[PDB]
Amino acid sequence: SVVTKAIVSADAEARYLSPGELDRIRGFVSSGERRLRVAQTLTESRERIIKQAGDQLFQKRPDLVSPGGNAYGAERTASCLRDLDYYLRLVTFGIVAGDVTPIEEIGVIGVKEMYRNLEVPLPGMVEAVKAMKSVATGLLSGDDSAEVGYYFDYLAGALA
Amino acid sequence: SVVTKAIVSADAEARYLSPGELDRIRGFVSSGERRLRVAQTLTESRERIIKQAGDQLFQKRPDLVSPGGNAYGAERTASCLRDLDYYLRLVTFGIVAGDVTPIEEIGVIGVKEMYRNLEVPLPGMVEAVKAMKSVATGLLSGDDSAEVGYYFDYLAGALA
Amino acid sequence: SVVTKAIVSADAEARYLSPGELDRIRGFVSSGERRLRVAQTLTESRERIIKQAGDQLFQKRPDLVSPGGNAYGAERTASCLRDLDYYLRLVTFGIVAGDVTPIEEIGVIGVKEMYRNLEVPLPGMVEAVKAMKSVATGLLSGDDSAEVGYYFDYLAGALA
Amino acid sequence: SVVTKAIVSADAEARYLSPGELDRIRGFVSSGERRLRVAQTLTESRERIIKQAGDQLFQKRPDLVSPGGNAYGAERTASCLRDLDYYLRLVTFGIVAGDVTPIEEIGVIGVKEMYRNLEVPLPGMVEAVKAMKSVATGLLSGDDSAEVGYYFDYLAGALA
Amino acid sequence: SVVTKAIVSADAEARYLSPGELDRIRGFVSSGERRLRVAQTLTESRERIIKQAGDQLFQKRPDLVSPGGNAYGAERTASCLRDLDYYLRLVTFGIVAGDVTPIEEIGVIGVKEMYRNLEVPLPGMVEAVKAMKSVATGLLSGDDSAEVGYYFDYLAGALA
Amino acid sequence: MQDAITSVINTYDVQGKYFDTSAFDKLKAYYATGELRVRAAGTISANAATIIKEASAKLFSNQPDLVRPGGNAYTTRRYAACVRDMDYFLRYATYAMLAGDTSILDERVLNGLKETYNSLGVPISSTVQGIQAMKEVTGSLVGSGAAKEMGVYFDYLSSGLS
Amino acid sequence: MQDAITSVINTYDVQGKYFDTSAFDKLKAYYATGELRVRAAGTISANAATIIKEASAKLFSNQPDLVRPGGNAYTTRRYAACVRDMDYFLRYATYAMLAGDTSILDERVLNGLKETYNSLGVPISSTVQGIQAMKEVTGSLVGSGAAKEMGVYFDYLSSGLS
Amino acid sequence: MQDAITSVINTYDVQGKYFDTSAFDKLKAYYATGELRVRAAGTISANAATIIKEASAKLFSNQPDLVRPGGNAYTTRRYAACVRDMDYFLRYATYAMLAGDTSILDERVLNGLKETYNSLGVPISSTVQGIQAMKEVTGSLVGSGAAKEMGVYFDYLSSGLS
Amino acid sequence: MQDAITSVINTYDVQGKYFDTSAFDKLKAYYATGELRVRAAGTISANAATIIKEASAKLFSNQPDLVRPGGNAYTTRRYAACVRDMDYFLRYATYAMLAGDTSILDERVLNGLKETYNSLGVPISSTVQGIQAMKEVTGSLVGSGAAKEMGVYFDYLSSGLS
Amino acid sequence: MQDAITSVINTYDVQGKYFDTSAFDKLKAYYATGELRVRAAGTISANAATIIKEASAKLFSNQPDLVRPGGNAYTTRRYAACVRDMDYFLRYATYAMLAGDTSILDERVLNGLKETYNSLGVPISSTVQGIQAMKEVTGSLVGSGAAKEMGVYFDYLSSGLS
Amino acid sequence: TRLFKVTALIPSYKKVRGGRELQNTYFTKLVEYDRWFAEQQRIQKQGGKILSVKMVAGKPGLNTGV
Amino acid sequence: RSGNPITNERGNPAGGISDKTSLSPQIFKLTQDNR
Numbered sequence A, B, C, D, E: 001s002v003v004t005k006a007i008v009s010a011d012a013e014a015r016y017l018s019p020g021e022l023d024r025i026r027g028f029v030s031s032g033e034r035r036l037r038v039a040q041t042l043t044e045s046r047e048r049i050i051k052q053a054g055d056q057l058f059q060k061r062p063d064l065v066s067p068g069g070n071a072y073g074a075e076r077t078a079s080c081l082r083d084l085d086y087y088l089r090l091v092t093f094g095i096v097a098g099d100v101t102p103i104e105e106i107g108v109i110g111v112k113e114m115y116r117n118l119e120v121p122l123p124g125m126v127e128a129v130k131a132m133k134s135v136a137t138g139l140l141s142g143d144d145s146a147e148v149g150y151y152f153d154y155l156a157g158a159l160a
Numbered sequence F, G, H, I, J: 001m002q003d004a005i006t007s008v009i010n011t012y013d014v015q016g017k018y019f020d021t022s023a024f025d026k027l028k029a030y031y032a033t034g035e036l037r038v039r040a041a042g043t044i045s046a047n048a049a050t051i052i053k054e055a056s057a058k059l060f061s062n063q064p065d066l067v068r069p070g071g072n073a074y075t076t077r078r079y080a081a082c083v084r085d086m087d088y089f090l091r092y093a094t095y096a097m098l099a100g101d102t103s104i105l106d107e108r109v110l111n112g113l114k115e116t117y118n119s120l121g122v123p124i125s126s127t128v129q130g131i132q133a134m135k136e137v138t139g140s141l142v143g144s145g146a147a148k149e150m151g152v153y154f155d156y157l158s159s160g161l162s
Numbered sequence K: 001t002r003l004f005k006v007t008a009l010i011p012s013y014k015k016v017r018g019g020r021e022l023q024n025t026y027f028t029k030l031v032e033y034d035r036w037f038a039e040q041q042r043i044q045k046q047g048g049k050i051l052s053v054k055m056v057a058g059k060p061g062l063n064t065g066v
Numbered sequence L: 001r002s003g004n005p006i007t008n009e010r011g012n013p014a015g016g017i018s019d020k021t022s023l024s025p026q027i028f029k030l031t032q033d034n035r
Ligand SMILES: CCC1=C(C)/C(=C/C2=NC(=C\c3[nH]c(/C=C4\NC(=O)[C@H](C)[C@H]4CC)c(C)c3CCC(=O)O)/C(CCC(=O)O)=C2C)NC1=O
Pocket: A064, A070, A071, A072, A076, A077, A079, A080, A081, A083, A084, A086, A087, A106, A107, A114, A118, A120, A121, A122, A123, A124, A125, A128, G060, G067, G068, G073, G074, G075, G076, G079
């Protein structure tokens, strides 16, 4: 969070928060209302976004769901879409928090070793995150599109 | 300034400015004229602010201008008022710049060693700047008063 | 003390005491009797010393006991003289110890923090220390006066 | 010397010399005449002390001079007595200095590896310096003999 | 041990043992029988090596047995030969181990301080080790002589 | 450390759930009080030395034996350590008030503090009284709405020592 | 860390005795099993990632709550730490098998592991289950005799944790 | 480092004078340009990868000997460093443009860069055409209005290397 | 640490009291003993290697199991560790004797030595025997008057270990 | 850093010869006025703060341009740096006076000071005036015998700058 | 022989890092005599090139005072 | 680890030079002109 990062910076230096840090917190709490609106809009549309992104990905990369592919079968495709839902929830958490810290903690630290143990392709994950960004930004407003796409591009770079 | 703070934070983290501090820069440049009008409103009232603050300080601390004190005599009281002039000008610089950076870089770094060299009591300084804060907030409306008081009480805490 | 300082300076480099340190300890234990005599002469006559030192301090710095001053009033003046008694007791401790060590730990570490938390003016403390030094050296002979003057000089410089 | 050690110790904390360091310097300069008479006495009788020290070594340690030893031969015996000359000169240096720093950084620092590079036994060195101490203290007066003996003991502890 | 050395090296980079380390272990395990036979040969030749090495050392360095020497007397010479037996046992342990680790861990770490606390001349120990090297290389033939000479060489270098 | 936003995020992440109405209500409740928290933190930062002054004076007036010979705060060194500890408590209470959470108190202040004070011989009751004194002195400066917020964190520290 | 050779060397140095026939017999037995040990270690090294993959798949299939929200392996971070721990166990079991002595396990693996996991919150029983799954996977790849050899070290780890 | 606003503050602080009308003329000029500066900075940050792509591509097309063996750019590490230097130049040019002053270019980039490149053997001229390629790409991308603003900073970097 | 002078000073400082006749009596006692203490310190510094030499030889002669294989002092490493510990004991006993107080012994040596030796497997009876060896070896070198003074510090070390 | 004792030791060491009567006479010359040196250093140590107080006061009274805006001493930071330089000069001159050697000034104070001051815009003439102010203020209090011995080092500093 | 003035160039051979590190590669610093052997060894370990070394504070060939 | 768990030196010998996460403490580095 913005507040957590400001407090941690001030505590590391054994000082109270400066006027600039308090100004950052002031701006963050001012923008909290519209960030909550963005997160709630993204939450209400979870089924539509996940479905449309899944079909877009599987049509764009048929080899994942083809026989011998990582997500072939009902259960493995369900696990694929469930990872997509995980990352959508993490994006909403980042929206409310004001930064990518919840995303990093919950789904970015150690992601490559995990997906390497799962034989899950990383380019597939990156394209899935790109499809999620496209679908979500297409559904929601243009002004909120940049804010949401910031976290989506962070996730896409992290898994890349 | 705010722009300098954002740039140095970006450079320390070694990446471009995010949309958040870009919005910070946009908000700062959008409010420049209000900062300039506040800087004037303080600037025409140099003498009234400084003299009222000195009167309040020597009301609370008659010992300072008592024989044996630091500000005893007309010339030393003049030096008192001139120091208050420096700090009022620094507060104007901080209001224009958007943050307190000119205030510390010109009048807070090494202030304790300077005033120890000058036998100047720091409690007198904090009382004087609190008096200047009380005087200067009255001249402004609430929206301007809050931000100016932020610089003034930052200066008071730094002197303490 | 001299023994303590020599032992710690030996231990920090994991060695036995050098000939210089042993010679220094010899000089100290040879001067111990005159050190005790000086501690006597300061100890019995201290009601006097405190009263004359406080009177001289408040004469040379009337601001402290002027309205608005730190030591204004009977009770704060009593606390002032109590601090003077503290420091002269520390001075006799240093004289018997042969070093300014007991003075240093008991009344020099954090003394600026403490007199800031009380807003006791450090120049006033230094002036009081010079007053005590003058009064005490008045009651000692030249050989004793020089020795007590070194400890008073250390105290005054430390408070400065 | 004593002045050098006090100055470097004070400058370690970037502060003026304590009354303890001033007192040790005062005791050092006060005793300059006796230690310089000691330097006279030692430098006047160099060859005698060196000769009796070599004789005492050879009788205490017949091992070294016997064939196969480090000191077997006339040239190696000459080197032995030459080293004794060096070390008594260093003892005089330390006596005039009042500190063992000249002895330290001329004949002590790196002496272990040095007599390793010369196949010189360090027990032989300590026996040599003990013989030197005995011969010198035999000639010196009661008070001066102790002062010479402390430096000789420092050297003995330094070698091995 | 060779296996222990390889395992420690592999754990240093946190990896499984490479094919090079594995085939090195294979060569060490296959060549075990010859190492045990070499350990035999030095095992039955006990007194021959001990006595011949002692005599060669005492001819090269009679000063050890000479008055003032460390090996002077029956008991001290017996302790000398006991030390030689210790180091021969360590060499055999190294031969079976395939590495000088037993020699190091058992009689090389702190041997300097030990023999300093016993006044034992390290060059004398080196001479004794070289005498043992000569005798042992005499007992063995060909590559066994070279590989035991490597260990005696390591011991001589460590003691030197 | 963990603040109110991160506390809600974690309590929902462990459940595996998206934000529901209750979550958004908690987030709204935090965001609504942000201006009060920032204003109080600014006031406390600018008046920290004065707060330490008044709390220390009150504490050593109620218990003058602390700073007199034989007291735990009797020397310049130990008096400095006392006022330094009080400053630490004030700074971390301000941090906990900005965060909206007491986690930083648990993971930077109260972790092993009681056993440290027991080892040092620091009187725990007197330190709790000093924390209370900081609480009254801060409540006057910040105002009632912020005084109540600072009170819960001061009481958290006091219960941690007690 | 000590292998069989080092153990013989130490048990003869403590006595002060030289090597006799019994020591040579024990060393000969170790060299007799050395070829089996080297082949097993090479096979395990060649397929470490595979072994971790089936072992973790089996563990998380048998205990699905571990990787679901509220489980100790629910995060990319914690999942990665879990498979890292599994790699630790496999690698150090291979070390112990190659040395022929369980000393390295007590020496670098099992020391303070219970306290560490209990402070972290890691389920000890599930870690033991992961070790047993790793045992089952490793046995099929290494063959019957090498499996019987590796089983003593896997069981040693499981009994040390439990 | 020093901004346009900090430059005015410094000029008036050295004189000892308060702000007057001319100071506000300069400050309002910067405030007016600020919207264009932040728009350009956002555009450059979004596409910075692309500017690097095409600038490095055409620089290497003009001077192929760098990437071929025997050239300074010939290595994976050396190519990475070559593109990282261009990233430095783009990012600090964006910094200077958003600040409106070239001080940061002197303090952080140009400070000793000549000697370090000359010691490492890096060709100065090739870096100059690289910066020229970068400024051409940015001028194409961000429009003429911000092109003329970024041109001064890119030329400043080139002249510093020149 | 603490010596006799500092001990008296601290007692009177905690009492807030003044130096009375008893304090000056104790100070006179220490100053009277000072020259003997300094002579003993110099003598022990001169012969420290010799004292360790003889004490180690005697301890290992009375208890030869230590240096034979299977003993706690049997290796070059463990023998050198024994000599290092004895050199500490001599140096710190000399420090305590010169100071006239055993606070340095407590804090620098005895606070944690029992647990260190119990964890290392070091025999404590034999260590006390080695301390007594150093005691009566240095007693001959310093003389009866100085021996009576250094003996109390050696017995303090022994009682702290026992 | 080398004194007169160490200087003659250095000469007679590089020559490798013994002390002669000239060396002993020089050592008499050192020891005779060492007592005056100790007195002067003792007086200066307590009055160093005051010496800097009115030394800087007079330096700024005679040249009010430095403290007024546009002067090199105009800021809290630069005023602090100025008085800090004043303290450095006083304390290092005290060290040189006590050691009896001007070597320390050359080693640490006068190494590149002139070019550094021209680099940073420090006026050499005004700094030398400050050195003269310290010299006369100190000589006012130490006494004429100490005043000359301190003025020689202050003039050495001034000639080093100018 | 007290203070050396050492200038050196230390390229990076193990990583490619995106922060500002121009100050780490080429730098002039003052090293103590007792520190200088180890400093020179450490610089040579990393593949750095030592350009110039000069005596600054102390005096070369001092038998005492070092 | 006070930071990323898989940056522990026991498993990752290069974990000391690994990229800092938000689990790690604040890192203070001095890059200011190193003059
Ligand atoms: C909150 C952080 C977090 C994440 C992200 C996470 C992902 C995750 N996905 C898994 C399975 C899976 N995940 C996928 C997804 C892949 N299929 C395609 O290749 C795509 C490239 C890609 C998705 C877009 C698939 C196919 C599986 C099934 C693997 C199997 O059972 O063999 C598993 C194994 C355990 C289980 O199935 O429940 C995890 C831990 N777990 C976490 O705790």
